[PDB]
Amino acid sequence: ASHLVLYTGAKMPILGLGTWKSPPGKVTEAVKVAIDLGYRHIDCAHVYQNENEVGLGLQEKLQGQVVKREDLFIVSKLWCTDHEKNLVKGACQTTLRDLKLDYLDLYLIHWPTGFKPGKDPFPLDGDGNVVPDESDFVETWEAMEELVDEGLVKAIGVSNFNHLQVEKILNKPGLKYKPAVNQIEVHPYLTQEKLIEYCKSKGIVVTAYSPLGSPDRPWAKPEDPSLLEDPRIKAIAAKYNKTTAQVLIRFPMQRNLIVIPKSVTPERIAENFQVFDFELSPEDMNTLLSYNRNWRVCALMSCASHKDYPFHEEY
Ligand SMILES: NC(=O)c1ccc[n+]([C@@H]2O[C@H](COP(=O)([O-])OP(=O)(O)OC[C@H]3O[C@@H](n4cnc5c(N)ncnc54)[C@H](OP(=O)(O)O)[C@@H]3O)[C@@H](O)[C@H]2O)c1
Numbered sequence: 092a093s094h095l096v097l098y099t100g101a102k103m104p105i106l107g108l109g110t111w112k113s114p115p116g117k118v119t120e121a122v123k124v125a126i127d128l129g130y131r132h133i134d135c136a137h138v139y140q141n142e143n144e145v146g147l148g149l150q151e152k153l154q155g156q157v158v159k160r161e162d163l164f165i166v167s168k169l170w171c172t173d174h175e176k177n178l179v180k181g182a183c184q185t186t187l188r189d190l191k192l193d194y195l196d197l198y199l200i201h202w203p204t205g206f207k208p209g210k211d212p213f214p215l216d217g218d219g220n221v222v223p224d225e226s227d228f229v230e231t232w233e234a235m236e237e238l239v240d241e242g243l244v245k246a247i248g249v250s251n252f253n254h255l256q257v258e259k260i261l262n263k264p265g266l267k268y269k270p271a272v273n274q275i276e277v278h279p280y281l282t283q284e285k286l287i288e289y290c291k292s293k294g295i296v297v298t299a300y301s302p303l304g305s306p307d308r309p310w311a312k313p314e315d316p317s318l319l320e321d322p323r324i325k326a327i328a329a330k331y332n333k334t335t336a337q338v339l340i341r342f343p344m345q346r347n348l349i350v351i352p353k354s355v356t357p358e359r360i361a362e363n364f365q366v367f368d369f370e371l372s373p374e375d376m377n378t379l380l381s382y383n384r385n386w387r388v389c390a391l392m393s394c395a396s397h398k399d400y401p402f403h404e405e406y
């Protein structure tokens with residue numbers, strides 16, 4: 092309704108601001124506007140290369156006494172080059188310093204795929220194929236657990252793990268803490284109800300990323316279906332006197348999923364928060380669900396031959 096609750100007890104705000112593709116020079120004002128409207132959850136990642144500028148906006152708000160740290164849910168993610176057990180605490184610490192924080196509320200393994208460690212975030216080989224490393228995410232998970240032990244993060248989770256990969260963690264001998272969250276792509280064209288159902292039966296909250304199907308993604312070829320311009324969802328939105336964006340954000344909320352839409356435009360950030368005031372009647376919910384095309388915006392074919400590439404599995 093307003094926040095879901097993690098198995099730790101922690102209240103996770105159901106709406107958050109996304110920061111991927113939000114440019115360094117715009118994301119500080121975007122984060123400030125968002126906290127001024129009442130957003131209390133920011134979704135970040137080291138690979139978005141803007142955590143420093145996110146941090147600046149947070150800092151201004153925290154020292155300006157506009158929010159208490161306890162009222163903020165800040166998420167970041169461990170990038171693929173940092174999956175070797177020994178690189179994890181370093182990567183978490185760099186993210187804390189950039190964000191100008193003492194702890195994270197949630198730290199996610201960003202993708203199940205470990206890439207060759209080094210300065211370059213996407214180490215490529217001759218064939219333009221990404222270079223794997225010598226690690227298994229169950230080892231990365233152990234290092235992610237030590238972050239909880241030390242108080243650097245309040246909960247750990249995963250992102251883009253298929254249900255068999257989540258199982259690998261859950262069935263790990265010696266497991267201290269289990270995935271509190273699994274953040275995955277969920278929108279009308281990829282409604283994901285089997286992975287959602289699986290996660291929920293395991294007690295793992297789901298965060299639906301790319302609610303509007305990422306119009307601004309780099310690889311957006313012009314003959315790709317725009318959820319925002321899909322006349323069908325414009326129609327259901329018209330009935331609602333709301334926008335396609337607003338009903339596209341309402342949809343995950345209603346399915347009891349955390350939503351993190353991205354915008355750097357102030358007006359749009361304010362629009363995206365104007366959604367806790369209407370409900371979609373079950374017909375609409377089911378029509379939105381019937382748009383399931385299994386169309387996946389974040390497919391990342393360049394990674395497909397990786398041993399832990401998540402999407403060759405049904406769910
Ligand atoms: N864990 C992962 O692997 C992963 C992967 C992808 C995304 N995510 C997270 O999910 C967040 C959201 O997904 P996304 O950024 O991929 O895409 P998205 O939220 O589906 O789409 C963002 C695009 O839609 C626009 N938009 C936002 N509000 C709008 C509105 N009210 N009206 C019209 N258009 C609007 C934004 O415009 P402007 O910004 O130009 O205003 C931007 O161009 C990301 O920022 C990231 O934090 C996580």
Ligand SMILES: COc1ccc2c(C(=S)N(C)CC(=O)O)cccc2c1C(F)(F)F
Pocket residue numbers: 111136138139171201202204213221389391392393394
């Ligand atoms: C695991 O492989 C990934 C993961 C993420 C990306 C991204 C990113 S940062 N996203 C799709 C957003 C995100 O992962 O949060 C962009 C380009 C290539 C990627 C790749 C890849 F390079 F292979 F295509």
